[PDB]
Short mmCIF file of all heavy atoms in Angstrom, two decimals:
data_model
loop_
_atom_site.label_atom_id
_atom_site.label_comp_id
_atom_site.label_asym_id
_atom_site.label_seq_id
_atom_site.Cartn_x
_atom_site.Cartn_y
_atom_site.Cartn_z
N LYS A 157 11.03 -15.95 -201.92
CA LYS A 157 9.84 -15.63 -202.71
C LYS A 157 8.78 -14.96 -201.88
O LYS A 157 8.16 -13.94 -202.33
CB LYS A 157 9.25 -16.91 -203.34
CG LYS A 157 8.13 -16.64 -204.38
CD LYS A 157 7.62 -17.89 -205.02
CE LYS A 157 6.76 -17.60 -206.21
NZ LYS A 157 6.54 -18.79 -207.12
N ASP A 158 8.50 -15.49 -200.70
CA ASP A 158 7.55 -14.88 -199.79
C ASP A 158 7.92 -13.44 -199.42
O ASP A 158 7.07 -12.52 -199.47
CB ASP A 158 7.40 -15.67 -198.49
CG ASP A 158 6.71 -17.04 -198.74
OD1 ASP A 158 5.98 -17.18 -199.72
OD2 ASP A 158 6.98 -17.97 -197.96
N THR A 159 9.17 -13.23 -199.03
CA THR A 159 9.69 -11.91 -198.63
C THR A 159 9.46 -10.89 -199.76
O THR A 159 8.80 -9.87 -199.55
CB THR A 159 11.21 -11.94 -198.29
OG1 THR A 159 11.40 -12.82 -197.17
CG2 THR A 159 11.70 -10.56 -197.89
N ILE A 160 9.94 -11.24 -200.96
CA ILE A 160 9.74 -10.36 -202.09
C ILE A 160 8.25 -10.13 -202.40
O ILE A 160 7.84 -8.97 -202.71
CB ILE A 160 10.46 -10.96 -203.31
CG1 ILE A 160 11.96 -11.06 -203.02
CG2 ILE A 160 10.15 -10.11 -204.54
CD1 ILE A 160 12.81 -11.58 -204.14
N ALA A 161 7.43 -11.17 -202.21
CA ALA A 161 6.00 -11.02 -202.48
C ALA A 161 5.31 -10.07 -201.50
O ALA A 161 4.31 -9.41 -201.86
CB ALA A 161 5.29 -12.37 -202.47
N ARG A 162 5.77 -9.95 -200.25
CA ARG A 162 5.10 -8.99 -199.42
C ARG A 162 5.76 -7.61 -199.42
O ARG A 162 5.18 -6.66 -198.97
CB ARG A 162 4.95 -9.53 -197.97
CG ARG A 162 6.24 -10.11 -197.36
CD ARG A 162 7.00 -9.08 -196.56
NE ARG A 162 8.08 -9.75 -195.77
CZ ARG A 162 9.19 -9.15 -195.44
NH1 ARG A 162 9.40 -7.88 -195.78
NH2 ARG A 162 10.12 -9.82 -194.76
N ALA A 163 6.96 -7.51 -199.98
CA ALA A 163 7.64 -6.23 -200.13
C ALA A 163 7.16 -5.43 -201.36
O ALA A 163 7.02 -4.20 -201.32
CB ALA A 163 9.12 -6.42 -200.19
N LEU A 164 6.92 -6.11 -202.48
CA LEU A 164 6.58 -5.43 -203.70
C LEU A 164 5.25 -4.66 -203.76
O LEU A 164 5.14 -3.63 -204.37
CB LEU A 164 6.67 -6.41 -204.88
CG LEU A 164 8.11 -6.70 -205.31
CD1 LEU A 164 8.17 -7.63 -206.50
CD2 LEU A 164 8.90 -5.39 -205.59
N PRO A 165 4.20 -5.20 -203.09
CA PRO A 165 2.99 -4.38 -203.06
C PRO A 165 3.20 -3.05 -202.34
O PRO A 165 2.48 -2.08 -202.68
CB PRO A 165 1.98 -5.27 -202.33
CG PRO A 165 2.75 -6.47 -201.80
CD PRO A 165 3.97 -6.60 -202.61
N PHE A 166 4.09 -2.99 -201.36
CA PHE A 166 4.34 -1.68 -200.72
C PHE A 166 5.07 -0.80 -201.72
O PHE A 166 4.80 0.39 -201.82
CB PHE A 166 5.16 -1.81 -199.42
CG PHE A 166 5.37 -0.48 -198.74
CD1 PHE A 166 4.40 0.02 -197.89
CD2 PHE A 166 6.55 0.25 -198.92
CE1 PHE A 166 4.58 1.24 -197.23
CE2 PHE A 166 6.73 1.47 -198.26
CZ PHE A 166 5.75 1.99 -197.43
N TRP A 167 6.06 -1.38 -202.41
CA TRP A 167 6.76 -0.66 -203.46
C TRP A 167 5.78 -0.07 -204.46
O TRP A 167 5.75 1.17 -204.69
CB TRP A 167 7.80 -1.59 -204.15
CG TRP A 167 8.21 -1.06 -205.49
CD1 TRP A 167 7.67 -1.40 -206.68
CD2 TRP A 167 9.30 -0.17 -205.75
NE1 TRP A 167 8.34 -0.74 -207.70
CE2 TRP A 167 9.36 -0.01 -207.15
CE3 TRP A 167 10.23 0.49 -204.95
CZ2 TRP A 167 10.29 0.83 -207.75
CZ3 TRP A 167 11.18 1.29 -205.57
CH2 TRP A 167 11.19 1.46 -206.95
N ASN A 168 4.91 -0.92 -205.01
CA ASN A 168 3.95 -0.48 -206.05
C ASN A 168 2.96 0.56 -205.56
O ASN A 168 2.72 1.54 -206.30
CB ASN A 168 3.17 -1.70 -206.58
CG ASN A 168 3.98 -2.56 -207.45
OD1 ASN A 168 4.80 -2.10 -208.23
ND2 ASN A 168 3.76 -3.88 -207.34
N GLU A 169 2.41 0.39 -204.40
CA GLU A 169 1.32 1.19 -203.93
C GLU A 169 1.76 2.44 -203.18
O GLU A 169 1.04 3.45 -203.18
CB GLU A 169 0.37 0.37 -203.04
CG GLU A 169 -0.29 -0.78 -203.75
CD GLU A 169 -1.09 -1.68 -202.81
OE1 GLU A 169 -1.41 -1.22 -201.69
OE2 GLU A 169 -1.33 -2.82 -203.21
N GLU A 170 2.95 2.41 -202.57
CA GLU A 170 3.36 3.57 -201.76
C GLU A 170 4.61 4.29 -202.25
O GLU A 170 4.69 5.52 -202.15
CB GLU A 170 3.53 3.13 -200.31
CG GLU A 170 2.35 2.42 -199.72
CD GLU A 170 1.16 3.31 -199.58
OE1 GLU A 170 1.33 4.57 -199.61
OE2 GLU A 170 0.04 2.81 -199.44
N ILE A 171 5.55 3.55 -202.83
CA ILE A 171 6.78 4.18 -203.19
C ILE A 171 6.74 4.73 -204.61
O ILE A 171 7.12 5.86 -204.88
CB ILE A 171 7.98 3.21 -202.97
CG1 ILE A 171 7.96 2.67 -201.57
CG2 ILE A 171 9.30 3.91 -203.31
CD1 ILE A 171 9.18 1.91 -201.16
N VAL A 172 6.25 3.89 -205.54
CA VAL A 172 6.16 4.29 -206.96
C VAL A 172 5.44 5.63 -207.21
O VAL A 172 6.01 6.48 -207.91
CB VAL A 172 5.46 3.17 -207.78
CG1 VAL A 172 4.88 3.67 -209.09
CG2 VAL A 172 6.45 2.03 -208.05
N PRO A 173 4.25 5.85 -206.60
CA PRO A 173 3.60 7.13 -206.84
C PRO A 173 4.48 8.33 -206.45
O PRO A 173 4.47 9.34 -207.12
CB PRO A 173 2.36 7.09 -205.98
CG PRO A 173 2.09 5.60 -205.81
CD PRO A 173 3.43 5.00 -205.71
N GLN A 174 5.21 8.19 -205.33
CA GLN A 174 6.06 9.26 -204.87
C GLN A 174 7.16 9.56 -205.87
O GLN A 174 7.45 10.70 -206.18
CB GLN A 174 6.69 8.91 -203.49
CG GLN A 174 5.62 8.74 -202.42
CD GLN A 174 5.11 10.07 -201.90
OE1 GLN A 174 5.74 11.10 -202.11
NE2 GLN A 174 3.96 10.04 -201.19
N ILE A 175 7.76 8.49 -206.42
CA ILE A 175 8.81 8.63 -207.41
C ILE A 175 8.30 9.37 -208.64
O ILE A 175 8.99 10.22 -209.22
CB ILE A 175 9.37 7.29 -207.85
CG1 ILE A 175 9.94 6.53 -206.60
CG2 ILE A 175 10.46 7.41 -208.89
CD1 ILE A 175 10.61 5.21 -206.90
N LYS A 176 7.05 9.03 -209.04
CA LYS A 176 6.48 9.60 -210.24
C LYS A 176 6.04 11.03 -210.09
O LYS A 176 5.85 11.75 -211.05
CB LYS A 176 5.27 8.76 -210.71
CG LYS A 176 5.65 7.43 -211.33
CD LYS A 176 4.39 6.68 -211.76
CE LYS A 176 4.72 5.38 -212.48
NZ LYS A 176 5.83 5.56 -213.50
N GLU A 177 5.87 11.50 -208.82
CA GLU A 177 5.54 12.86 -208.54
C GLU A 177 6.84 13.71 -208.49
O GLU A 177 6.80 14.88 -208.29
CB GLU A 177 4.78 13.00 -207.24
CG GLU A 177 3.36 12.39 -207.29
CD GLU A 177 2.71 12.40 -205.95
OE1 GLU A 177 3.25 12.98 -204.98
OE2 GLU A 177 1.56 11.83 -205.84
N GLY A 178 8.01 13.05 -208.60
CA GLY A 178 9.25 13.73 -208.63
C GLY A 178 9.90 13.83 -207.25
O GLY A 178 11.00 14.39 -207.13
N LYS A 179 9.26 13.29 -206.24
CA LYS A 179 9.88 13.24 -204.92
C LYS A 179 11.12 12.35 -204.98
O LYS A 179 11.06 11.25 -205.52
CB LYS A 179 8.93 12.75 -203.82
CG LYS A 179 7.84 13.77 -203.42
CD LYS A 179 6.69 13.77 -204.36
CE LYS A 179 5.75 14.97 -203.99
NZ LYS A 179 6.44 16.28 -204.09
N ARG A 180 12.20 12.82 -204.43
CA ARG A 180 13.43 12.10 -204.37
C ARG A 180 13.40 11.17 -203.13
O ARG A 180 13.35 11.65 -202.01
CB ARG A 180 14.60 13.07 -204.36
CG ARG A 180 14.68 13.91 -205.66
CD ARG A 180 15.37 15.23 -205.37
NE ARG A 180 14.51 16.14 -204.58
CZ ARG A 180 14.87 17.33 -204.17
NH1 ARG A 180 16.06 17.85 -204.48
NH2 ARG A 180 14.03 18.05 -203.47
N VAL A 181 13.45 9.86 -203.41
CA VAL A 181 13.17 8.85 -202.41
C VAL A 181 14.41 8.23 -201.81
O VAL A 181 15.37 7.86 -202.54
CB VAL A 181 12.26 7.77 -202.99
CG1 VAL A 181 12.15 6.60 -202.04
CG2 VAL A 181 10.89 8.32 -203.32
N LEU A 182 14.42 8.12 -200.48
CA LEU A 182 15.45 7.31 -199.83
C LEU A 182 14.84 6.09 -199.18
O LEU A 182 13.82 6.23 -198.47
CB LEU A 182 16.19 8.15 -198.81
CG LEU A 182 17.26 7.43 -197.94
CD1 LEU A 182 18.43 6.91 -198.77
CD2 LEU A 182 17.74 8.30 -196.75
N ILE A 183 15.38 4.92 -199.43
CA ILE A 183 14.86 3.67 -198.80
C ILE A 183 15.97 3.05 -197.95
O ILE A 183 17.05 2.71 -198.46
CB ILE A 183 14.42 2.63 -199.82
CG1 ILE A 183 13.32 3.24 -200.70
CG2 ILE A 183 13.88 1.37 -199.10
CD1 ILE A 183 12.84 2.23 -201.81
N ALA A 184 15.78 2.95 -196.64
CA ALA A 184 16.73 2.28 -195.78
C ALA A 184 16.19 0.98 -195.28
O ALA A 184 15.21 0.98 -194.48
CB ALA A 184 17.12 3.16 -194.61
N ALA A 185 16.71 -0.16 -195.70
CA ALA A 185 16.07 -1.38 -195.35
C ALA A 185 17.03 -2.55 -195.21
O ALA A 185 18.15 -2.35 -194.67
CB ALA A 185 14.98 -1.73 -196.41
N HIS A 186 16.63 -3.73 -195.64
CA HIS A 186 17.44 -4.94 -195.36
C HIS A 186 17.81 -5.66 -196.62
O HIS A 186 17.27 -5.42 -197.65
CB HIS A 186 16.61 -5.88 -194.44
CG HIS A 186 16.04 -5.20 -193.21
ND1 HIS A 186 16.69 -5.22 -191.99
CD2 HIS A 186 14.95 -4.43 -193.05
CE1 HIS A 186 16.00 -4.52 -191.11
NE2 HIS A 186 14.89 -4.04 -191.74
N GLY A 187 18.82 -6.57 -196.53
CA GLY A 187 19.28 -7.28 -197.71
C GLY A 187 18.14 -7.90 -198.54
O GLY A 187 18.05 -7.66 -199.73
N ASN A 188 17.26 -8.65 -197.93
CA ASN A 188 16.27 -9.38 -198.73
C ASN A 188 15.07 -8.54 -199.21
O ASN A 188 14.57 -8.78 -200.33
CB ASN A 188 15.80 -10.63 -197.96
CG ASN A 188 16.91 -11.66 -197.91
OD1 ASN A 188 17.31 -12.24 -198.93
ND2 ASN A 188 17.39 -11.98 -196.71
N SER A 189 14.63 -7.56 -198.43
CA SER A 189 13.59 -6.64 -198.95
C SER A 189 14.15 -5.80 -200.11
O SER A 189 13.48 -5.66 -201.18
CB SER A 189 13.03 -5.78 -197.79
OG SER A 189 14.05 -5.24 -196.98
N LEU A 190 15.37 -5.34 -199.95
CA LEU A 190 16.01 -4.59 -201.03
C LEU A 190 16.23 -5.48 -202.28
O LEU A 190 16.10 -5.04 -203.41
CB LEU A 190 17.33 -3.94 -200.55
CG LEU A 190 17.22 -2.80 -199.54
CD1 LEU A 190 18.61 -2.36 -199.13
CD2 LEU A 190 16.40 -1.63 -200.06
N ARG A 191 16.52 -6.78 -202.04
CA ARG A 191 16.65 -7.72 -203.15
C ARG A 191 15.35 -7.74 -203.91
O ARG A 191 15.35 -7.74 -205.12
CB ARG A 191 17.00 -9.15 -202.66
CG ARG A 191 18.49 -9.44 -202.57
CD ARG A 191 18.70 -10.87 -202.05
NE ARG A 191 20.13 -11.30 -202.09
CZ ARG A 191 20.60 -12.34 -201.42
NH1 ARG A 191 19.84 -13.05 -200.60
NH2 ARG A 191 21.89 -12.64 -201.55
N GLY A 192 14.25 -7.71 -203.17
CA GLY A 192 12.95 -7.66 -203.85
C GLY A 192 12.80 -6.44 -204.79
O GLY A 192 12.39 -6.61 -205.96
N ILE A 193 13.18 -5.28 -204.31
CA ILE A 193 13.09 -4.08 -205.13
C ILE A 193 14.05 -4.15 -206.34
O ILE A 193 13.66 -3.83 -207.48
CB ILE A 193 13.35 -2.81 -204.33
CG1 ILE A 193 12.19 -2.53 -203.37
CG2 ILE A 193 13.57 -1.59 -205.25
CD1 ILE A 193 12.54 -1.59 -202.24
N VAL A 194 15.28 -4.51 -206.11
CA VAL A 194 16.26 -4.61 -207.18
C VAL A 194 15.83 -5.62 -208.27
O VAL A 194 16.08 -5.41 -209.48
CB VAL A 194 17.62 -4.98 -206.62
CG1 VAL A 194 18.61 -5.22 -207.77
CG2 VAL A 194 18.15 -3.86 -205.74
N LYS A 195 15.23 -6.72 -207.79
CA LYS A 195 14.76 -7.76 -208.75
C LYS A 195 13.67 -7.16 -209.61
O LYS A 195 13.71 -7.34 -210.84
CB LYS A 195 14.23 -8.99 -208.02
CG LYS A 195 13.89 -10.11 -208.97
CD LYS A 195 13.23 -11.29 -208.27
CE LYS A 195 13.10 -12.48 -209.23
NZ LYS A 195 12.01 -12.27 -210.23
N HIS A 196 12.73 -6.48 -209.04
CA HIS A 196 11.66 -5.83 -209.81
C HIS A 196 12.24 -4.79 -210.78
O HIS A 196 11.81 -4.73 -211.94
CB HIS A 196 10.62 -5.18 -208.86
CG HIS A 196 9.52 -4.47 -209.59
ND1 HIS A 196 8.46 -5.09 -210.19
CD2 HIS A 196 9.34 -3.14 -209.80
CE1 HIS A 196 7.66 -4.22 -210.74
NE2 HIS A 196 8.18 -3.01 -210.49
N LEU A 197 13.16 -3.94 -210.30
CA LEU A 197 13.73 -2.88 -211.12
C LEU A 197 14.49 -3.42 -212.34
O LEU A 197 14.32 -2.94 -213.46
CB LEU A 197 14.70 -2.04 -210.29
CG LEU A 197 14.17 -1.04 -209.25
CD1 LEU A 197 15.32 -0.37 -208.54
CD2 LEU A 197 13.24 -0.03 -209.89
N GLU A 198 15.39 -4.36 -212.12
CA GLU A 198 16.27 -4.85 -213.18
C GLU A 198 15.70 -6.07 -213.92
O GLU A 198 16.33 -6.58 -214.83
CB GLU A 198 17.67 -5.15 -212.63
CG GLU A 198 18.31 -3.97 -211.88
CD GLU A 198 19.73 -4.22 -211.47
OE1 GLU A 198 20.24 -5.34 -211.69
OE2 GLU A 198 20.35 -3.31 -210.87
N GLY A 199 14.52 -6.52 -213.49
CA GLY A 199 13.86 -7.68 -214.06
C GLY A 199 14.73 -8.94 -213.97
O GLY A 199 14.81 -9.70 -214.92
N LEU A 200 15.38 -9.12 -212.83
CA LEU A 200 16.31 -10.23 -212.67
C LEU A 200 15.54 -11.53 -212.49
O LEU A 200 14.37 -11.58 -212.16
CB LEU A 200 17.23 -10.00 -211.48
CG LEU A 200 18.11 -8.76 -211.57
CD1 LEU A 200 18.91 -8.58 -210.29
CD2 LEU A 200 19.07 -8.83 -212.76
N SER A 201 16.27 -12.63 -212.72
CA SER A 201 15.73 -13.97 -212.49
C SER A 201 16.00 -14.41 -211.04
O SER A 201 16.75 -13.81 -210.31
CB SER A 201 16.43 -15.00 -213.43
OG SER A 201 17.76 -15.11 -213.07
N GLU A 202 15.32 -15.50 -210.65
CA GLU A 202 15.43 -16.05 -209.32
C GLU A 202 16.91 -16.36 -208.99
O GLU A 202 17.43 -15.99 -207.95
CB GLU A 202 14.55 -17.30 -209.18
CG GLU A 202 13.08 -16.93 -209.25
CD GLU A 202 12.11 -18.13 -209.26
OE1 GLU A 202 12.52 -19.29 -208.95
OE2 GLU A 202 10.92 -17.92 -209.53
N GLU A 203 17.58 -16.98 -209.95
CA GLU A 203 19.00 -17.36 -209.79
C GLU A 203 19.87 -16.11 -209.55
O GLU A 203 20.70 -16.08 -208.62
CB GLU A 203 19.49 -18.11 -211.04
CG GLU A 203 18.88 -19.50 -211.18
CD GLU A 203 17.39 -19.51 -211.62
OE1 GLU A 203 16.88 -18.48 -212.15
OE2 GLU A 203 16.72 -20.56 -211.41
N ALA A 204 19.72 -15.13 -210.43
CA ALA A 204 20.53 -13.91 -210.36
C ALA A 204 20.28 -13.18 -209.02
O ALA A 204 21.24 -12.73 -208.36
CB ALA A 204 20.26 -13.00 -211.54
#
């Protein structure tokens, strides 16, 4: 929960605007930070 909570504000404030400007984004990161992004994207539950 903590990991995802400090990863998503970066996603929202820095990555999202780039995506919306049409910039094609590459993210190279780690299992749990990426879990944070995937959870936000697919609206997954804690269990999933």
Side-chain angles (χ1 to χ4, degrees):
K157 189 176 192 166
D158 292 335
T159 299
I160 299 182
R162 48 93 169 152
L164 283 182
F166 184 83
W167 161 267
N168 286 323
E169 296 173 20
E170 307 294 341
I171 305 191
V172 158
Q174 298 282 343
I175 301 183
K176 285 180 178 314
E177 294 173 6
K179 288 80 189 60
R180 296 154 288 180
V181 171
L182 176 65
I183 303 177
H186 309 264
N188 289 295
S189 44
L190 291 178
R191 269 178 173 165
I193 290 162
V194 173
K195 186 185 189 286
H196 178 78
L197 287 178
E198 304 186 359
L200 299 176
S201 67
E202 293 174 14
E203 292 72 20

